[PDB]
Amino acid sequence: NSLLTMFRELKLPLQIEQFERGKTIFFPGDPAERVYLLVKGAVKLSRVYESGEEITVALLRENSVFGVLSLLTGRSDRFYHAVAFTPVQLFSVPIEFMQKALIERPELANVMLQGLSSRILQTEMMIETLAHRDMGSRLVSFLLILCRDFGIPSPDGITIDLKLSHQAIAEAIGSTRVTVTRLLGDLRESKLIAIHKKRITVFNPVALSQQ
């Protein structure tokens, strides 16, 4: 909760911004002039290669601070591509307002420090996921992250609340569409997960951890 209440107040109030699914929040090349708080939805940070291929660096969940490059002072240019993965609501602030707002309303550098601490650890989770030698573990590991980040209770289990193309999954776990199609499909038959409308449900993740 806390982060919302910090950002909002940052003399006139801060308006929430809407972003349609697929709309860019920032392009590689833009000046890194801003910090953001993702309020609702999912934002995908991606690295684009001159080769054409993209890699997902982070699928960020709600109440996440991002754009964090702007805090490094000296400005700089974005090198990642920030996109609304789902429909997105966020606050953005120019860097300077954050410097002062933190200084003055003192309690809340602690909220930003916790916000940023949260992000470091989450990324380190993603590394652990990407390091598994066998791709199936990666998938399961990734799916489990998506359950606690985007999971919504169903009668039939926990349901990752995202339109996830297999291609999307491919670009996050460092694989290809064909492999993930086969792995998923083999978790479907194993009665370990279920898929409808591009959304995945993992039964008893507690269990999926144990196998």
Ligand X SMILES: O=C(O)CCC(=O)C(=O)O
Q: Is 49 known as a binding-site position?
A: yes
Verify binding: residue 120, ligand X, rule CB under 6 A.
Answer: yes
Verify binding: residue 72, ligand X, rule CB under 6 A.
Answer: no
Q: What residue 178 binds from a second copy, ligand X, none (CB within 5 to 8 A, per partner kind)? A: none
Rg (CA), the chain: 18
- Round to whole Å and give the CA distance between 88 and 136: 30
> Which of 19, 66, 85, 91: binder of ligand X (CB under 6 A)?
66
Verify binding: residue 68, ligand X, rule CB under 6 A.
Answer: yes
Torsion of CA 149, 56, 120, 4, to 10 degrees: -50
Contacts of 125 (CB under 8 A, 6+ apart): 145
Backbone angles phi, psi at 22, to 5 degrees: 90, -15
DSSP E strands in 115-192: the ranges are 151-154, 157-160
CB atoms within 10 A of CB 180: 25
Q: What residue 78 binds from a second copy, ligand X, none (CB within 5 to 8 A, per partner kind)? A: ligand X
The 94-123 contact track toward a second copy, x by CB under 8 A, reads -----x--xx--xx-xx-xxx-xxxxxx-x
Verify binding: residue 1, a second copy, rule CB under 8 A.
Answer: no
- Round to whole Å and give the CA distance between 159 and 196: 10
- Round to whole Å and give the CA distance between 202 and 195: 9
- How many residues lie near ligand X (CB under 6 A)? 11
Burial class (CB in 10 A: 0-12, 13-18, 19+), 75: exposed
CB of residue 122 to a second copy, shortest distance in Å: 9
**Using CB under 8 A, which residues numbered 27 to 66 contact a second copy?**
45, 47-51, 55-58
- How many residues lie near a second copy (CB under 8 A)? 44
CB of residue 29 to ligand X, shortest distance in Å: 10
Binding site for a second copy (CB under 8 A): 45, 47-51, 55-58, 68-69, 71-73, 80, 99, 102-103, 106-107, 109-110, 112-114, 116-121, 123-124, 126-128, 130-133, 174-176
